[PDB]
Assembly symmetry: C7
Homo-oligomer: 244 residues x 7
């Protein structure tokens, strides 16, 4: 799930263990593609809502301006092309948890709607007046300083405070170097199992190579380097290409 070793990273998980027991909103900060995904899934699994549903949406990746319709759902005719009814992500997360990835990418109007969801514990689909009662635990993510974003007038202050009771900052890779190697081995394992392949190991000098690179792209970059290495082929031996 999430295996790690840097002491700083262990402290974060201990922190995550404390909020997990409660139903507080968690904000996960840090660079994108740095592994915030599993920390979210980790929190849900440690929470009383573990058996409930876990729903994730990436607010920075929904095409055709469909973000708002995805979250809130809609009735037929709510907008051009709404040719059927569809339930929102919140409705799907009922009794469980919802992850709102890259939340800083919602427009102000959308933030106002999210704010009403949070304080009212209810949601209404687009083109509908009926409110649907909600029992949902909210996790979110931002790769931005949200306070800064508030002060620049792009993020609502009242929403910032409701989403920020318990911020956890997930470090970049270069400031938890002890997590490289268990991460890399986990990436290998993951990739080979999915392809139905024996999982190889990483020679010590490749490890060193991996430990002494700053990882501008963090884990997304690491996962790339590692998949490339497997192509250059099995049991990895300074088949590690950074920027050569």
């Amino acid at each position: 799930h999430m295996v790690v070793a840097d002491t700083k990273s262990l402290k974060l998980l201990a922190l995550a263990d404390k909020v997990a027991k409660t139903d507080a909103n968690v904000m996960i900060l840090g660079p994108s593609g740095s592994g915030k995904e599993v920390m979210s899934r980790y929190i849900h699994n440690a929470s009383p809502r573990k058996e409930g549903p876990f729903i994730a949406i990436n607010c920075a990746a929904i095409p055709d301006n469909m973000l708002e319709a995805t979250l809130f759902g809609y009735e037929k005719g709510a907008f051009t092309g709404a040719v059927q009814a569809c339930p929102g992500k919140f409705e799907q997360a009922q009794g469980g948890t919802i992850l709102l990835d890259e939340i800083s990418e919602m427009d102000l109007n959308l933030q106002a709607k999210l704010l009403r969801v949070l304080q009212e514990r209810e949601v209404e689909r687009l083109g509908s007046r009926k409110s649907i009662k909600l029992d949902v635990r909210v996790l979110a993510t931002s790769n931005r300083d949200l306070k800064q974003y508030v002060q620049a007038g792009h993020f609502r202050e009242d929403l910032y405070y409701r989403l920020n009771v318990f911020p956890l900052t997930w470090p970049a890779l270069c400031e938890r170097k002890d997590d490289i190697e268990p991460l890399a081995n986990h990436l290998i394992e993951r990739h080979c199992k999915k392809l139905g392949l024996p999982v190889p190991s990483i020679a010590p000098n490749a490890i060193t190579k991996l430990l002494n690179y700053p990882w501008p792209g963090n884990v997304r970059e690491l996962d790339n380097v590692v998949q490339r290495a497997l192509i250059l082929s099995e049991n990895g031996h300074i088949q590690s290409e950074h920027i050569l």
Copy 2:
């Protein structure tokens, strides 16, 4: 109805005065400083006590619906007006309406609100029928309205009409003696979901809370207090901007 600071107590004594009458009351001071309970207090201490109390945040109605929810509308009044709907003024009949963050109303909306205040009548959008009103008006603003008038963003005639009895609700750091009893209250109300309320917080944590400027006022305190309860139960060593 919580306070202890001498400054705040003088304010509630002034509240008591206006409450007796039907005068419009404008509440100034920063957003999320506690205003909403001043207004509920004023209503409770007023002869309209048994009447409805209706509030609206003019800065938090999405989809441009603020005007629609204030005045109500008839079916067809605008695109989406698919039904008739009473406005907030109608609902406050015989009681009190609180217009929070009034400084957000655009000039046209302001001109409509002025008429309501002058005629004690209101018409729904898409209707020519005026409804006789008996409503006590309360309002809040987090900005200096005199200035906003002088900048051409707020009607002068509306400012005076709402300015009979302006009460300024000071920032938290300017009423430091409210911080301890506020923190406590915030603790009990939060725990009031099968949580045994941890007491006061330890004296050193009191001190810590007293020696912080609270740039986010009561909203910030609430965050800090709920965060403290997560970290856990009967607090000592909790967190704020400049945690180290």
Copy 3:
């Protein structure tokens, strides 16, 4: 008709003169200096006293309904017009219309008002039918209309027709003798409106009232006095800058 300052008394006497005539009267000076007493005073001194008195605030009509309100309209004349509706001029027939804050009309509306004044007729929006008018005109402005003409924002012919007889109602600090009878006056009516004995005003509170410049003129004074009543029934010290 509540004044005692010499400025004001002379003003009212001038107003008594136009009153007897059918001339357009323009009332200048700041808004919220209570120049509504003047226009209603004029109507009541006029031969049209028993006729309707119709006021409209040109600077306070929402949704751009100003034109439709003045001139009236037929069903379908513009989007939203689902009925016929008489204008303010029609309602003022045989009496007086008050066009408060007239410097706010756009130029197109001014041309229409000019034709109304010249032809003594009015057409509703979406109608080609003329309605004969017998209506006395009064108006106000808090702007200098002459400058507004030279800035190209106001028609010159309309200016001349509206300004045969301008009366400038001065700021409160320029008629300090009006302050106390005014203060007493609106105490009385924000007391009679609630049925209870009218309280006294401490001599020192008086001097406090007379020595303030009143940037908001009568509108401001009204606030101060209402506030004084809330702080309760016997003026001693109630005020307008805690600093």
Copy 4:
């Protein structure tokens, strides 16, 4: 009508020469300086005196309706055209049309007026039917049309067609001998609608009027005179323009 300054008398004698002809006449000079009657004069001294006299102010037609009222229209020529309507030229058939303030036409309207002058026929908007015309044309501008041509705002060919016999009506201060009979005529015309015509009385009213430069010309004098009659209604000296 009603003049005394030799400057004015020469203009009137010039007008008598043109009136006998069918030439287009352009009358220059400031707005609200009395052109209306000089046009009227011209028509009365013309062989068409028994014909229609039709006047239109190009600077005062609301709602962009200038073109519609000039040329007329058929039902549905534009949105709002719910009927057929004769234009001003049709109404002037066998007489005279006055286009006051012609410099206010946009260029496309000018091109249409040019055609009408050339072909002596006119077509209603939304129609292709031409109506042969027998109409004498008079016109005014308060601006230098020649410079207006050079600024690109007025058609050269239309300027020439309308500039056969331009007559310049001087500002009031440039013909002071007119001011006293003008005042008198303004008073009577105004009192003629109920009251008895007072005299302007000796100078101290007259010379006061005479030593003022009248930036607003006769519209301004008209106002001063009406105001004076309010101040009141027999004597004078109570003339106000600065104060």
Copy 5:
């Protein structure tokens, strides 16, 4: 055209030459300098004299109807095309068309004209039937068309086609000897539709007429002469205006 000044007479001899042919003729020179008749002179001197002479002023067609007037149209071709209507080229069949002030055609229009010139065929707006043409083209321009080409406002290929044979009709002050002969004609032409031809116009008036630079050329002269007749019969002193 009535003239003297040799230079004018030289022009007419050039005109007599083109007239006998079918070539396109461009008449240059200021507007309102008597061009309109030189073209009619060309028509009458040409073998097409008995045929139609058709004139359109490209700088004077209101409501953008120039293209519709030139080419004609079918019902519905544009909004308000409520009937069929033949173009000017159709009406000029077997005769001559004068395109006055052609420099005012937009580029699209010019391309259409070019094709008419090249194919000797025309098509009505909103139709694809081409009508065969047999039409002599005359044009005028009060501007330097070669430079207008260089300014990218006039097609080069069209420039060459219309300028086989340009005739530059000079401004009045450049042919002083035409003035008196023209003047009398104006007087003669006018008293024609009325009474006895006044002229006998003092010689001092002639001199006055001859020594004026005529900024407005013939149109100005027409004005002065007409004005003169109004001030009375038998020209003596006349205006331009109350001196300078």
Copy 6:
């Protein structure tokens, strides 16, 4: 036109080599410099010489109809498409198409052309049916197309597709030995028109024609020589350039 200058004879020699093939030929040089003869010559020298020869001038199609006439269209393909209509490529089947002034196609049209060249099929607008094409392509530009590519106005892939065999047709002043045969040919064709063909220009007129630089090339020459004929028959110093 016979052609004689040394330069030109070599270009025609090059044209003959590429004519025997199916290669796209691009002809550079100034517009109106006789490129039409090069294109025609290539077709008549090619194996497809008996097939259709279709020319379009991309810089001369009004109403933005260039794409429509190139590709053809179905009824309804666009506002005004009230008919099906075959494109110029279809009409060129088994032969040759000349795309004159190709540099004028917008980038979207260029991409559509590139597709036709690549797939050797074409779709009419508003259709999605492919028509197989056997058409040889010739093109023309008066721009340097490489530079037009580097400026972002022309597709690089399209440039390379059309650039296999570019031929630069020289300006007139650069093939001076061609001026006299050309001049004679121009006169001769023009007079085929019942006019007897006027003899080969006086020698002095030839030298006059030779010592001019001809900024307008053949278009300008044709202009001059037609003028000369009007200054009638048999040419001397009837040649005008700038005087």
Copy 7:
């Protein structure tokens, strides 16, 4: 394939390695430099050999139809969509899709592509039905994509997914040993598709070809060769860029 420059040979050896896997391959280098062959070489060297090979040039789809072409659509999806139409991904099921000049896709379209790679399914425009996908992706770009990312024109997440294994095909003046065999190949080709004549080529012409920097790379070489063939039909020296 068709190369002899050792740099080129190393490139193919890498191509062979990635070919046997299912990884996305990105081919960099200048446009008009022969990426075409290579994509195809990979396909034919991969386990998806006999599956369909589908190529689309993202820089060459007119009328803004790239999105429609890629994803397909139902009738009524956009204006003009008068039929249902399968997308390129559907056509490539069990095979390989080549996305040429991918840097040319807009951000919205990039976000849809990302979803296709992540979820291994595709919706037609104007439909909610997801088609399960089994397709190997190849891509090309003549731009430095990392910098395109840094300039904000390309999605970072999509960049990483497309670049586990970038291969950079150098310009012709970096692989001068490829030039002669390539020119021969074009001669062979462009006269196999004729009346089957017979080829040739002269020493001094080779030198000419070898000492030119080829700003247009392969595209320009092809013009020169075709042109030279026209200019004769045997031997040479008549190679042109004067």
